[PDB]
Amino acid sequence: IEEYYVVPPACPPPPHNPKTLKYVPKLNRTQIIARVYEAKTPTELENSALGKKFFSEFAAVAKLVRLSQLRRANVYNSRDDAMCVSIYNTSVRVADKLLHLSSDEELCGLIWALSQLPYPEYENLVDRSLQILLEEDKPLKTGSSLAVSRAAAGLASLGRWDASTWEVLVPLLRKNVQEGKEVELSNLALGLYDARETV
Amino acid sequence: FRRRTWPAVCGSLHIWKKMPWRIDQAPPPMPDSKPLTRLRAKRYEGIKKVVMPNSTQLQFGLYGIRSMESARLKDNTLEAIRRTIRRKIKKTGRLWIMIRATVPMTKKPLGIRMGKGKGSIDHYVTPIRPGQILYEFDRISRPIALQALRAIQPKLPCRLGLVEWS
């Protein structure tokens, strides 16, 4: 007295049957990044990129960078603060799994974003990013002074004060100041490092 | 107008409300093959005069025959109609039968006075509602359907009509 069961067969969709008749255009990496930055509230930032196809390593960095800008520029209530916490917790965990796929600019932005945000730092996200960029060749070949300026400012705020890394950055920061590129960040980093040397 | 008192409007014990069968508008279900019952019924159970819904159509075939009036048909009548339809249409015809006699009827023998309880089962009947579809056909032509309609009309007490799917 024991009955048995037969699992119904699966239903594969027929070929040449469109999934939707609505117009849903394809999105590339550039479009997703633009969409993420063009956000005004934590809710829009949270919904700017969801799903494993769009919530990639580059999207996680963009969310953290934009979150820092919004946190500094605006004051939020309890509900929005909870939204901000959720954004931070998810983005860092994604970064901890796809860190090896990040580019030089993304790593530089990640360090700057983590320094500004007040939430607890994840396991070793800053240290891992430093190790990948510690070859001393990526900073030298970093054509965009923005990435170098963000990295220099981030470490100064975090108080790393690495002797080797700073020595390389000093001539680069001075060159950027002479060229008039990223003066505010370069000057801020140089001033902070000079203060540390005095102290 | 509804015949109830104020306490009934608020604290009625009739929580599960079912519409009585005599006036329910739901179409009857397809006949099954269950055996006929041996439990006597009441005369109302074999009669129903409410019309069919205004959305009834053919379900399986392309042609069919409907009743324009209510009636109560016995088992003997259906058997004669079935033979007439089968002979008239063909052996190679598709026929759906949508009716069946299932309500028992009682009768008492001659020479018995009134009283001393209800009688014993004698035959079975089925109620027919106005506009109801009785038979459906397929694998035939329209002229053949008309011939079937004319063959059975003299054998039934109600007016009949033709239905087509479109």
């Binding site: 239903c11 969709p13 027929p14 040449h16 049957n17 469109p18 999934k19 939707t20 008749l21 609505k22 | 019309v51 069919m52 819904p53 205004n54 959305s55 009834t56 159509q57 409907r66 324009m68 009036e69 089968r86 052996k91 190679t92 015809g93 598709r94 026929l95 759906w96 039968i97 106005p130 506009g131 109801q132 397929d138 694998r139 009509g161 239905v163 799917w165 479109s166």
Partner: protein, 202 residues
């Protein structure tokens, strides 16, 4: 083109007077109350035109067609309120007499998505190995559901049975899918056509 007349707000019991005059009540669904003033529009259509449409297309066939509706004043036929593009949805018909009672229509622009139950048609049924042997083609689903755009609604689905033998079955997977439409539901692998010799064992 169909002609419709405006109505006053009346009770359900006043509908039988319109039919006696020779008009059938109609309702057009699918408007925006903010910009049009109503979510639904009530009118009446002459019975003579209504019967011609049903006969020409059919009770279920007309649901896959697009029609034009002109609204005019009943007292003055030359006063035109406007024009609408709609598709029939359902028809209410008496069971005892087969007369129209109420017509449901949907406002169907050329850029809207609608669900339509399209009838299935057969081609070259006479020339088929199964028919020659002595079988017949049995249709199990007269209508099949599709999601179509307003500008492209298939009048019917053409299924060719010129190369079907006995026991051949055509499932939903094999049905044509014209441009601008997709199959609805998930119950694929459902029998639509069947070439057999059984006659129901009657």
């Amino acid at each position: 083109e169909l002609t419709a007349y405006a109505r006053t707000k009346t009770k359900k019991s006043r509908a039988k007077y319109l039919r006696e005059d020779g008009n059938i009540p109609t309702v057009i669904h699918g408007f925006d109350k903010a910009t049009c003033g109503f979510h639904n529009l009530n009118l009446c259509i002459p019975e003579k035109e209504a019967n011609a449409m049903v006969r020409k297309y059919g009770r279920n066939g007309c649901a896959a067609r697009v029609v034009k509706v002109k609204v005019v004043d009943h007292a003055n036929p030359e006063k035109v309120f406007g024009y609408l593009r709609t598709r029939p949805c359902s028809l209410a018909i008496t069971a005892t007499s087969l007369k129209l009672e109420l017509m449901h229509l949907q406002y169907c622009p050329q850029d809207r998505l609608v669900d339509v139950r399209v009838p299935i048609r057969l081609i070259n049924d006479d020339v088929a190995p199964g028919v020659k042997k002595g079988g017949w083609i049995s249709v199990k689903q007269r209508l099949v559901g599709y999601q179509c755009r307003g500008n492209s609604i298939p009048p019917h689905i053409e299924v060719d049975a010129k190369h079907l033998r006995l026991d051949d079955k055509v499932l939903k997977r094999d049905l044509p899918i014209p441009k601008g439409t997709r199959l609805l539901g998930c119950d694929f692998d459902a029998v639509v056509l069947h070439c057999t010799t059984d006659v129901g064992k009657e």
